[model samples]
Target chain A: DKKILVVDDEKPIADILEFNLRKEGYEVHCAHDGNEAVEMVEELQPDLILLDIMLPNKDGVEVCREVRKKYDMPIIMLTAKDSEIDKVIGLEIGADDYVTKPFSTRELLARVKANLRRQL
Target chain B: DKKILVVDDEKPIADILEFNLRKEGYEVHCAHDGNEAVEMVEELQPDLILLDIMLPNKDGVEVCREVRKKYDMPIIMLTAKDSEIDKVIGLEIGADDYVTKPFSTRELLARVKANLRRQL
Candidate 1:
């Protein structure tokens, strides 16, 4: 099972994504805030991360920056904000890709597969 | 079954929404342009309409306004641009809700249910 870490402050969005990702046959772990997500990174050693932009403890770009210092795993940033600045920030901080809010399940799954393929 | 009319110039977005709405037991019909959408509104008389802001024949606000003149069903306007002005215009034109593009299917489904609830 390819371990995937899902980090989002919104429980519902996180839950549905977890459900869909799990259905795709990946082992999914959830973190509701940035701090919990950072802690779980070492604990889970995830193959990929679906990181949301805004969080309780720390925002996503900061987490992405910190985590990139330690891991090379693919990170896809999720944001409700569709600003070009936000997109630029996420990629500049080392995110593999970014999806704006209310994203399609098909699109998310496609991004996940494409990012995962980089390992092969 | 609740019937829904989906109007978008983009077939892929329309198809994805159709797939998700159908999964929720909604009978969906699609229109590729504003003219086709306006024509089908009279024919289908759907319970709800998911109308996109940009279209080939007519802009979504004009379509929403034109449709409101004839039908009173709930309309959810979809747009790629998330400006407050765009949202204000949609609501002013009698759209029941404004959904920014790249929205989660679950969120969209929830809005559909909530709006449909208003009718009953």
Candidate 2:
């Protein structure tokens, strides 16, 4: 089974995602902030990470760079902004993929499958 | 290869996306929420992003704005909500386009390809 670490500050979204992913038969984990994400990554060794951009403790971008210094796994960023500028930076730093807010549970599941397959 | 960052909090959704994008020959990556998505960008560096709204903490709207604060890239919002308000926010924040929830895979790919072409 593939284990994925989900890091974000929103509880409802996390819960919904967990419920949905488990329904699909994949192991899942959750982290609440940038710091928590880092901790989870080190301790969990998940096959993939679904990361958020703005977080408590530090921004997600910094964490991605930090984690990359130690690991080679993929990282995906979350965004809600309308401009393309910041997303380009996220990509520049290292984010492997991104998804916008208000996204459907179904599309998310599909994206996860697509991204992980590449790494696998 | 062109790279796309697929962000979502749900593992199964991410998985599906991973599988499809890879099969289509696009390099892909993923993130779970706003903070993690941002982190991935700072490390993995994909060419584009599929952003989700309603994420934890910063939310997709805020995350999109934050990411736009630094760079510009092709961003497409995966909106789960079928409300006009969501579409308004996604466009206002700088998303290139919005894909409503439960959309067809063909529609999603067409939108992505169209946007990719437009960006070029």
Candidate 3:
């Protein structure tokens, strides 16, 4: 099964993602802060990452940059609705895709599958 | 100025697209059917295309497939909200991105710029 790392500071949001992603048969892991998210990327070597933009330690942009320095894994940014600039920056800095908060489960799942399929 | 082709059978949607895209400084053109879209693609060779899935003559999928055989320009699928299968097919068949109907102009423009930037 493919493994996915879910990174967000909010437990409820993380839990929601964990539930849905696991239901899709992916092995899902959670990281609560940006630093742990980056650490886990190396430790877990997940096939993909659902990274939130705001975090306690490093922030998602820094984490994405740090991870990209070594890994080519697909990283999808989870951003707030109003942060259009962040979305552009995320893509410019190497995020494979992004979904605004309040996105549909179907849409996110489709993106995950599409990005993973592209890698193959 | 960068050029974009807007292909949709619906006049209102196409007009809105043309107006907004022109306002953003793109040289926008409209094609009311799939056949014209394909013909104009080779004739104009726009930097990108915003293709609607439901169209006359040939569907967007056919247009995308046909265009991919020759052109490497970015194609963003414009799909209906419920057409999840079409979205998957669009991505699998070489579309760079997709936005469902009733999509925000901001989101669509962001995707447009992002895909164009990616091709750079």
Candidate 4:
């Protein structure tokens, strides 16, 4: 019954996440840009978000800040391989966790489940 | 001063971790196998542990279970790539976090700091 908002600019990766998360019985929603990402978070108030750091209209860090100001829902940043600074910044701004690109689905799911467990 | 125990059967990786962690102002200890890892945990009562899953003597899972049974210190599992099952099992068995093999030093250090922050 948990809802997850997956925000990413790339369709293929977003689609893959949608498929996997849906299979896990989560109600999955996708936003392809950072502006939509923030808008959706305000509207949907999802249980968790899988947010990519690079996106159009805005960026994951700003979205994270905006959401954290009002919500405590888990936000897990999706980062690129060399974006160590972004990963650290995302966490400092209140991301619960992060996974680099080319991440294994199982590892990502494990982190998602772990963060959600902490919320309870 | 915060203390960290780095446990790995592989000396090179262990040395690298110790060097980096020490440079960050943490007192670092090395345990080359699982049994020693558990022993040192009891003796040193470190702030955190960097534990490799594929350790000699007893293996990391057993070490994690034994440590978790008594200690509340953070344990970050150092996992091999493609060992999704081990990663999941590590988390299930109470690992605080994990980094896949060939992880960047920055990423690993970020995780270390994040987990240590949670302990505070």
Candidate 5:
């Protein structure tokens, strides 16, 4: 089973993703905060990561950089601030892609597949 | 941090979306290709997925099908260009809605939030 990691400070968002993803038959994991996500990283060893930017305890970018340093898995950042700085930095930090907030579920899944190919 | 996922190959489009959504206080994730999208779901476990009709390994339809088999969650499809067929099958496979490209960010966000509310 493929393992997915969802990192968000919000409970509903994480639950929503978990609810949908689980229906698709994939193993799902959720982290309420960036700190919790980091802890889960080592324990979970997920194939992909969905990260949030303005997270508690070290934000998304910091988490991406920290994880990217070792794992080559896809790191997609969650940003509330969609500045060029965020996009450029996200890629620079080794994130595979950047997704803006308030996006549709359709677009997000397509990008996930694209990113997986990039890693391959 | 409302969870939101965006999938798009075009850097500019994804960037603009990321900028707007983050400002809206929604947590976000992004994917760039079709194949990777299937992989990201387990890892990201987004509450909802926005898929692209045309993609690399798997098109939006195929990806949505795979996801739906396991997760009975809400999905929204995005057409590469605007096509009624995309809309038809998108809903057939359990997609809640379909948005064409070159869409306004305002409409996208409104729909996403609206859909989330609808689920409740």
Candidate 6:
């Protein structure tokens, strides 16, 4: 099964992703902050990361910056901001794609499948 | 791969099984009480359930009885009680298998695999 690490401070968002992705047959692990996300990435070695931009402890940018150094697994950023700079900077850092907040599960699911398929 | 719902009030036990079972490529869902367990069983429709005998909100036996009426999925009871009556009664009530508290993870994994296979 494909493993995905979800990094988000919001419990509901993480739970939704966990349930939905698991339904898609992906093993899902959740982290509430950048600190936990980093630890799980190393420990679980998931195939992808669904990371949120704003977070407590270490923000998504820093997590993406660091995770990029050691791992090349796909990362898709989730941010509340619709800022063009957010998209550019997030992609420049390492995120394969970025989804602004208020995005639908269907859109996110499609992005997840699109990215995973590239790896194949 | 098959999915398993582990229903236990003990967070440590649930986490242990979740980690191990996911390691074995089975998608695992966890519920901290019998009510939550029953809800997720309906929501997730897992292939099997590992239900603890004691739980807050609703006890295991009642949960097992109710689940058995609505679904034919396999359920394994986990209990601290070592009494033979507990074993006999648990099975008679609808549990397909029972494991005493402090059972090895290896044995639990074996039973999980065995029961899932029996369905095939």
After the best TM-score superposition of candidate 6, give how far the Cα of residue A67 lies from its true spot, in angstroms.
Answer: 0.6
The per-model lDDT (C-alpha) reads 0.80, 0.73, 0.86, 0.84, 0.69, 0.78
lDDT of 2: 0.73
lDDT of 1 by residue, B2-21 (tens): 99999998889999999999
- Cα RMSD of predicted structure 4: 3.8
For candidate 6, write residues B1-120 as lDDT tens digits: 898999998999889889889998999999998777888988999999999877777888899988987998888888764354444455667776666667666556756765665412
The DockQ assigned to candidate 2 is: 0.04
Candidate 5 matches the true fold with a TM-score of 0.51
Better-scoring candidate (lDDT), 3 or 4: 3
Candidate 1 per-residue lDDT, tens place, A49-83, comes to 99987876799988998898899998988876435
How close is every model to the real structure, measured as TM-score? 0.50, 0.51, 0.89, 0.73, 0.51, 0.48
- CAPRI grade, predicted model 1: incorrect
Q: Candidate 4: deviation at residue A109, Å?
A: 4.8
- What is candidate 5's lDDT per residue for A59-82, written digit by digit as tens? 787888788767878777765433
- Candidate 5 Cα errors over 4 Å, as ranges: A81-84, B1-100, B103-120
Task: Summing lDDT over every window of 10 consecutive residues in candidate 3 chain A, give the lowest-scoring window.
Answer: A111-120
Worst ten-residue run, lDDT, model 2 chain A? A81-90
Residue by residue across A1-120, what tens digits does model 2's lDDT show?
889888888888777877888888889999988888888889999877878787767788898888888986767676664535444455567765666665667557656665565411
Chain B TM-scores, listed for every candidate in order, come to 0.94, 0.90, 0.95, 0.94, 0.88, 0.92
Candidate 3 residue lDDT tens string, A1-120:
999999998999999999999999999999998888888988999999999988868978899999999998888889887766767777788887888888889888887887777512
Better of 1 and 4 by TM-score: 4
CA RMSD, predictions in order: 15.2, 16.5, 2.1, 3.8, 14.5, 18.8
Candidate order by lDDT, decreasing, is 3, 4, 1, 6, 2, 5
TM-score of chain A of 5: 0.86
Error of 4 at A26 (Å): 5.5
Error of 5 at A107 (Å): 1.2
In model 3, which regions exceed 4 Å deviation? none
